[PDB]
A and B are shown apart, each in its own frame.
With several copies, the nearest count.
Chain A
Amino acid sequence: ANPLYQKHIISINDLSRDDLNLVLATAAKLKANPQPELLKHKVIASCFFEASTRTRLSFETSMHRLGASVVGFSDSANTSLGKKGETLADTISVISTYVDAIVMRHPQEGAARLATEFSGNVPVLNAGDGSNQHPTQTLLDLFTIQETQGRLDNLHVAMVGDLKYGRTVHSLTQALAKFDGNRFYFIAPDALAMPQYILDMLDEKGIAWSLHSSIEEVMAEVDILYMTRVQKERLDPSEYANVNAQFVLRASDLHNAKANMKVLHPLPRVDEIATDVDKTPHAWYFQQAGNGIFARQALLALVLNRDLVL
């Protein structure tokens, strides 16, 4: 018996309600009862073409936490003087005969999808492929909202900053859309607003949403407050300076906050949250990435093991 054994795991759209609930329940079971010899005698590659530091160590920790070995590389922005190395179909093919699974991060979008048929029966997990969203980040986001609020249904989840380009928020809205009753706020400037394809998905499923101007306008009723990257190399420095005024979450805009509210963040951060919201009960974004150990551990045990009794 196995649903997600030897599966693709490339995008969140492929995963249904029954796929997300198996990874969250398995992440709560291995956290409550670690199995350090589950993936023993099984090698996993960590082929990070795009250099992500935090994402590679949250994955390689989860590999070593089940007792598997690791073989990985990290290129520091390659494409030196035009033409470089091999093709990506030629790399995955030779890496596939070496190991039992691949965990690849690519700057170009559609790289994880290019590796399913070429790998054969070797599964390939997507750790972030360009602007085609980050599904492992979406799984540890749902796991943090479930373990604190008590559920994933009937929650007041707000989303601040980069919504147009912020990939981590796009599929966080589509994952929560599969759950019912979820109210949605979208606090963003008139530029970095949520796209029309996400808003049309919410109108189709009868899910209520609304655009807001700032944090304090929705602060009275919120169970989660997802906060995004918003990098300076995106909108020009004059535009970034003007809008970034009310959108930053100071500790002064937490007086209406509920007792069970929890601020999240995919990371990193710099000019969205200051360093005085860490000494609160609402601080819950550092241990969200630590909860990503259990989300990527549950996602690796399901694919590299026939059946499991936690």
Chain B
Amino acid sequence: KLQVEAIKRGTVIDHIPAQIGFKLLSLFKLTETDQRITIGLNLPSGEMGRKDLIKIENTFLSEDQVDQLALYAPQATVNRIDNYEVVGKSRPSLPERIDNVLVCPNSNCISHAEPVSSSFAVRKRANDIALKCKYCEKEFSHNVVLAN
């Protein structure tokens, strides 16, 4: 699978790590579409052996939307796909806040069984990415706010 590309407007990204393609089409809700969905999950694309991808036809994504990929897919990109050409393959980039896709580690946080949306702040240290909580205001390392 080395020739393809250039199919329906929208855009497609590259360099999705392995096992990062899935669970990204869900946390950001992207399956909820009625058009050309052909993910490239579990398919090497370069230097590394394991990599995944995802493609979307007529569907642009705000700089802010793409930047919200960084944390998960730190080594990927975004090149506006229309049909043979490309308009700036902008890589993702750590946003100044991540909402709707992170649960707070503070069990006694008001935001868990409440009818509101999550929201964290961003800053790197040197070791991890401490995302701070919006409500409780306590700060955690991405590795902790990630899984559990």
Contacts and interface: CB of A to CB of B under 8 A. Distances in A.
Q: Do chains A and B touch in the complex (CB under 8 A)?
A: yes
Interface residues of A, number: 34
A259 interface: no
Contacts of B105: 238, 241-242
Contact of A89 (B108, B115, B136, B139): B115
Nearest to B108: A237
B144 A245 contact: yes
Contact of A241 (B111, B116, B144): B144
A88 B110 contact: yes
Given A110-B133, A110-B135, A238-B136, A117 B144 contact: no
Contact of B110 (A90, A108, A248, A275): A108
Given A87-B115, A241-B140, A245-B148, A113 B108 contact: no
Contact of B136 (A13, A84, A110): A110
B147 A245 contact: yes
- Chain B interface residue number, banded: 20 to 34
A109 B136 contact: yes
Contacts of B135: 109-111, 113-114
Nearest to A275: B115
A294 B113 CA distance: 32
A197 B138 CA distance: 10
Nearest to B115: A275
Contacts of A243: 144
B32 interface: no
Contacts of A117: 116
A244 B115 contact: no
A84 B107 CA distance: 13
A106 interface: yes
Nearest to A271: B148
A17 to B, nearest CB: 20
Nearest to A197: B139
Contacts of A237: 106-108
- Counting from the closest, the 5 A-B pairs by CB-CB distance are A110-B135, A275-B115, A241-B105, A109-B136, A108-B110
Given A109-B135, A242-B144, 14 more contacts: A11-B137, A108-B108, A108-B109, A114-B110, A130-B136, A131-B108, A131-B138, A133-B137, A237-B108, A238-B105, A238-B106, A245-B141, A248-B147, A275-B115
8 contacts: A13-B137, A109-B138, A110-B110, A132-B138, A133-B137, A232-B107, A238-B108, A241-B105
